[PDB]
Amino acid sequence: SLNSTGLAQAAINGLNARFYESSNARWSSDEPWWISGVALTMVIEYMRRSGSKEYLDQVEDVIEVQRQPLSWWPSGEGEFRADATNDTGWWALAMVRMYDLTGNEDYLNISIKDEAYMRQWWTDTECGGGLYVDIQDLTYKNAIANELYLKLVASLANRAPNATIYLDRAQQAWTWFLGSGMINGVNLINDGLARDSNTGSCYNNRLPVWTYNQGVILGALVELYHATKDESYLLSAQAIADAVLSPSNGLTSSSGVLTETCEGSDSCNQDQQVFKGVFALNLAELGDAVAGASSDPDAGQDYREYLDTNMQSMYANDRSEIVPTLFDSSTGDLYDVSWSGPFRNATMPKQASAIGLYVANI
Ligand SMILES: OC[C@H]1O[C@H](OC[C@H]2O[C@H](O)[C@@H](O)[C@@H](O)[C@@H]2O)[C@@H](O)[C@@H](O)[C@@H]1O
Ligand SMILES: OC[C@H]1O[C@H](O)[C@@H](O)[C@@H](O)[C@@H]1O
Numbered sequence: 099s100l101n102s103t104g105l106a107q108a109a110i111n112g113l114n115a116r117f118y119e120s121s122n123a124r125w126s127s128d129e130p131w132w133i134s135g136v137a138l139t140m141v142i143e144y145m146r147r148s149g150s151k152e153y154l155d156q157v158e159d160v161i162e163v164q165r166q167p168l169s170w171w172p173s174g175e176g177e178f179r180a181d182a183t184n185d186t187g188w189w190a191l192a193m194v195r196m197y198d199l200t201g202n203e204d205y206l207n208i209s210i211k212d213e214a215y216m217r218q219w220w221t222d223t224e225c226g227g228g229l230y231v232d233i234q235d236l237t238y239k240n241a242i243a244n245e246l247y248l249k250l251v252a253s254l255a256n257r258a259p260n261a262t263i264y265l266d267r268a269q270q271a272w273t274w275f276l277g278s279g280m281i282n283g284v285n286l287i288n289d290g291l292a293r294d295s296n297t298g299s300c301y302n303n304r305l306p307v308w309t310y311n312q313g314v315i316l317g318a319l320v321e322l323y324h325a326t327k328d329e330s331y332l333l334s335a336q337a338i339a340d341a342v343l344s345p346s347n348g349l350t351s352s353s354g355v356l357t358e359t360c361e362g363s364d365s366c367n368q369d370q371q372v373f374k375g376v377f378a379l380n381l382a383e384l385g386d387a388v389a390g391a392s393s394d395p396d397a398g399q400d401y402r403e404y405l406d407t408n409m410q411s412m413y414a415n416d417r418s419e420i421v422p423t424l425f426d427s428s429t430g431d432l433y434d435v436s437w438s439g440p441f442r443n444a445t446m447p448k449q450a451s452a453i454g455l456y457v458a459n460i
Contacts, residue, residue, distance in 0.1 A: 100459075109430065113430075123159045131185060133369075134164065136372055140453040144453065145199055146199045182233055191250060229243060245275075268322055276334075279300075287307065308370070309356060310372075313379070319332065354411075355438040372447035385401030405459050417431055417433060
């Protein structure tokens with residue numbers, strides 16, 4: 099009885115009415131810039147799966163302005179090339195989805211510039227591969243910057259000209275990620291790697307298991323499947339997704355609701371508030387690829403049922419509505435960080451995570 103398309107549009111309206119800045123062509127200048135890129139990916143994804151184009155003009159506005167050289171990183175020379183490789187990766191993947199929606203080669207070209215920019219900080223001399231996240235310091239090869247890069251080259255291997263060098267880079271990047279040790283004994287991905295002070299060897303730093311570090315890798319393995327037709331990539335993604343859905347690992351509550359590790363202590367900062375929706379959208383990409391790769395009608399049913407359970411829970415316990423006025427006739431929905439907990443406030447990262455879950459059910 100739940101229309102995920104209608105609720106996604108209501109959440110996007112709530113996101114715009116409360117957090118969109120027309121004068122800046124950006125959501126919430128007080129919140130991390132990379133989350134505007136995630137929010138743009140959510141809006142673009144809503145339009146792709148629903149067939150709507152209500153926000154196409156707004157998206158183009160954001161793209162044209164945020165494409166300019168960043169005031170805090172002019173050496174990047176615009177095209178979303180920022181001071182952290184993970185910032186560039188989020189916008190690069192948004193530009194891939196923009197190309198998927200419009201077919202405009204201009205957006206694909208941004209994604210190609212972003213790939214070359216990110217590879218500038220891939221080094222085989224530390225950890226045998228992988229790239230750094232802190233461009234200025236080069237002290238952290240974490241999980242998210244390398245999952246974003248892996249998903250980028252894997253997508254370019256399916257859409258860009260000269261896609262062979264991108265397929266070669268994606269297969270080598272996955273080989274490094276697998277052998278890095280960041281995937282642990284229960285098939286979940288820790289935050290990043292640390293380096294031995296004496297030997298220079300790298301090891302899993304045992305930092306928290308974040309939901310979006312279990313999601314972006316699924317989209318990367320799905321794009322690696324499309325380019326190779328090798329179901330081995332899907333099986334590896336399925337093992338990671340299964341670990342997230344298993345209540346023994348703590349990411350799935352006893353009610354079957356996705357729960358970030360910081361929700362219990364109510365310590366989720368601006369970054370962590372958006373992590374859940376990123377995983378949900380990527381899990382929908384896996385479930386779609388799994389269902390199409392087999393003739394079983396029940397293929398991917400566990401992932402679809404999981405997304406539906408979380409949608410209903412957040413529908414009933416995490417929802418609020420903006421108060422309409424005599425002057426502002428705007429309508430929509432607002433959401434907090436916990437998909438099962440109550441509503442205390444609504445911020446842009448929590449709103450963006452909200453849209454991602456609804457779009458994952460479209
Ligand atoms: O919150 C957990 C993550 O925290 C850091 O990533 C977020 C921050 O780092 C990015 O380089 C920049 O975009 C910042 O603006 C952003 O706030 C990393 O430690 C990451 O590995 C963690 O998962
Ligand atoms: O304002 C500074 C600007 O650059 C920083 O590196 C990032 O945190 C951005 O999110 C922020 O908007």
